[PDB]
Amino acid sequence: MASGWANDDAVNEQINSTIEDAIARARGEIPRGESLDECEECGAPIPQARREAIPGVRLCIHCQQEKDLQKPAYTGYNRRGSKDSQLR
Ligand SMILES: [Zn+2]
């Protein structure tokens, strides 16, 4: 039974977005919460078309069109909780 085999707190914090947020403001490696210009699959030229259509695209039009099919178009979720999602 896979329990206490690898999933630790002191290894999950590297996986946490704290690291990428630190590097984003440190050297400007990570973009401003938006799309990139190089496909994470095959390093292929990301078109501005995919960038402006999809806020945070990581797939060139070739690798994207196949995953666009695999997009569920639903959540079926239940995450009870309130947040600051406003403009004051
Ligand atoms: Zn690609």
List keywords for this structure.
monomer, 88 residues, mainly alpha, 4 helices, 0% strand, binds zinc ion, structural genomics, unknown function, Zn finger, partially disordered
How many whole angstroms does the radius of gyration measure? 17 Å
The rough form would be described as: extended
Taken in chain order, the helices and strands follow as HHHH
The assembly state of the depicted protein chains is monomer
Beta strand %: under 5%
* Main sheet properties: none
DSSP summary, beta strand count? 0
- Span between termini: 49 Å
Structural class comes to mainly alpha
What's the number of domains? 1
Bound ligands: zinc ion
InterPro entries: Znf_C4-type_bac, Znf_DskA_TraR, Znf_DskA_TraR_CS
Keywords: Metal-binding, Zinc, Zinc-finger
GO molecular function: zinc ion binding
Zinc finger (dksA C4-type): 39-63
Q: Can you describe this structure?
A:
Pfam families: zf-dskA_traR (PF01258). The protein is an all-alpha fold and about 90 residues long. The chain has one domain (about 1-75). Helix content is about 35%, strand content about 0%. It has 4 helices and no strands. It has helices spanning about 10-15, 20-25, 50-55, 60-70. The longest helix has 10 residues, at about 60-70. The radius of gyration is 17 Å and the shape is extended. The structure holds zinc ion (ZN). Zinc ion binds near residues 39, 44 and 62.
Summarize the structure.
A zinc finger (dksA C4-type) spans 39-63. By secondary structure, this protein is an all-alpha fold.
Secondary-structure map:
Elements: H1 9-15, H2 18-26, H3 48-53, H4 61-70
Bound molecules: zinc ion.
Zinc finger (dksA C4-type): 39-63
Pfam families: zf-dskA_traR
Keywords: Metal-binding, Zinc, Zinc-finger
